[PDB]
């Protein structure tokens, strides 16, 4: 009668924390989280906008 | 007496310079702390 907690399958866990893949750069278990995006970096007006490379780890 | 005076003046100068260097060493941290807290708040907002 519940959406079973995605504790088991890594794919299910990521789906839950990504909201079925909706979340891009964040993961959360909290349902009351206020969704925010990363702030604009302070050097964007100085250095331009760099393509953020995802860390290899 | 002249030798003593000259040596004392030299020692005073050397000690003043050493004290200046020691105070500079013991008195960038703020900038690094600010950067860390900015990173942390941006990470919190993105994660949120």
Swiss-Prot record, chain B:
It is found in: Cytoplasm, Cytoskeleton, Microtubule organizing center, Centrosome. It comes from the Eukaryota. Phosphorylated NEDD1 can interact with gamma-tubulin for targeting the gamma-tubulin ring complex (gTuRC) to the centrosome, an important step for spindle formation. The modification Phosphoserine is found at residue 27. Required for mitosis progression. Promotes the nucleation of microtubules from the spindle. Interacts with FAM29A. Interacts with HSPA1A and HSPA1B. Interacts with gamma-tubulin in a HSPA1A/B-dependent manner. This is Protein NEDD1. The lineage of its organism: Eukaryota, Metazoa, Chordata, Craniata, Vertebrata. The chain holds residues 611 to 660 of 660 of the full protein.
